[PDB]
Symmetry: D2
Subunit: 158 residues, 4 copies
């Protein structure tokens, strides 16, 4: 079941399909709150040539926008790059393919950098076990529970 990019046994092809934003976390809370550049409502991941395509809605000024971004695979094992509100590097922390997928992102913009962790799921919501499991990883990565936000409880531009 489980796989990671840092383990090399990740079959990226199975990540293709529909995904929903379940939980976001970051010690740069500003970024994941109402109007934050990172409060994304995932819709679909496309597996392309040495790249991943993301279709998602983001609410700007109270209005949902339809955005699409292409992330390119880099030479650093399991790493992907994407230009969005700065230079972003991310990796697939863990996934079971048919339920959840956990991404760990590092942003860079004007000298400063911050981390981001997201729990995208195949269903509009996931079991607490998973959300709890995610929460634990966020803390392990230095993200306090105050900066973990459950999006299933709010509007996700649906």
């Amino acid at each position: 079941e489980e796989a990671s990019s840092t383990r090399g046994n990740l079959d990226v092809a199975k990540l293709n399909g529909d995904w929903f934003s379940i939980v976001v976390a970051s010690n740069k809370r500003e970024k994941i709150e109402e109007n934050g550049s990172m409060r994304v409502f995932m819709q679909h991941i496309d597996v392309l040539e040495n790249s991943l395509g993301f279709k998602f809605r983001i609410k700007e000024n109270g209005e949902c926008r339809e955005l699409y971004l292409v992330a390119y695979k880099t030479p650093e094992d399991g790493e992907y790059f994407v230009e969005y509100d700065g230079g972003n590097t991310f990796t697939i922390l863990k996934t079971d393919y048919d339920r959840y997928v956990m991404f760990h992102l590092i942003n860079f913009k004007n000298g400063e950098t911050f981390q981001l962790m997201v729990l995208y799921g195949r269903t509009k919501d996931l079991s607490s076990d998973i959300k709890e499991k995610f929460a634990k990883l966020c803390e392990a990565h230095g993200i306090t529970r105050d900066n973990i936000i459950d999006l299933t409880k709010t509007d996700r531009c649906l």
Copy 2:
């Protein structure tokens, strides 16, 4: 004088201006020979917002093409990303700003990866000391002298 991105004391702003391709090296020689995707003839580097712009000519099918690429700064110290003939990551190995600049690049395309090192200079040519100094770094990075090519001796789409 000297500065590097891996030392953090790099003032990228001083890299702005005109640059010429002096020497290229790679153990994937195919890439740096006549018609190789990497046999680039640098012209100008633009320092932009969290990115670097490169204007260069590349000879395809005996015809010089005018190309421009934007590389984005990543969260990994001194690293930049650029999509060109695959996913590329590179860093400024060493520079004195007013004469030379040495770049170290790692390419990724369809599972395989190769290294590239270039000696871009502010004048159509550089002293042998420098070329020798570059050659030594290429070898230190596992690049044999047979794969170091002096472009000042050939046509550079000038």
Copy 3:
């Protein structure tokens, strides 16, 4: 039922969803034959902000590639732009939303320009009436029947 972009009554939002490549036509046949830059096997159209996203497979060197392109709406009524094997301009010639969609494209690359017409359908194939109807429009646009190719008869990277 029927709508066009040149009639202004086109509800682009209904073009969202899955589409298949049924028939391609162009008097630059080279472009639509085995290995041609235009022999695309459509998969999905995404309606985005003032743009359209296309997910399609194209067979290069006997190997199917997963590609995604974003086309931007232009000020010229019903026109969209997309950079792919040159500068492309296209319009939705006709559509009934639930079955077929006909696109007319004009490519530009290195001084020369050529036309392209495609019949993308919601099912792996369409009735002959439609294919015949398409064929007639291709001829009206100066495309001879020899340059109209039925892709349902060949491999479409499925």
Copy 4:
């Protein structure tokens, strides 16, 4: 001397080099005032493969940003496309190559469209004859003198 894209005798290659923003005009004044998406301070035009590269500074929130945009040539004679604050189409209205260049742009964003005309010059300023000549063309294109702004009189992120 004089040439236009609508006359087909335009040698785009001679537009390569440094350019300064002399005068901007638009009946969507909001766009060309302090903080307007169109109040651009041109720096350099790069002639590339079926495209034009623009390096310019734009003052956002009192801070000058370094931006670079690539515009692609389209099949419509003399027309170029560029995605910036919407879909843009533009043409070179008139130029003498060594002094001035006049661009006419049409923007499209969320159903609405507006025109823009710019007088980019090779020197920090141009003779009144030229500015007057430009002003006249702006009026001919329905742009009133109140919406013509002389940038040489203000800060141009220099």
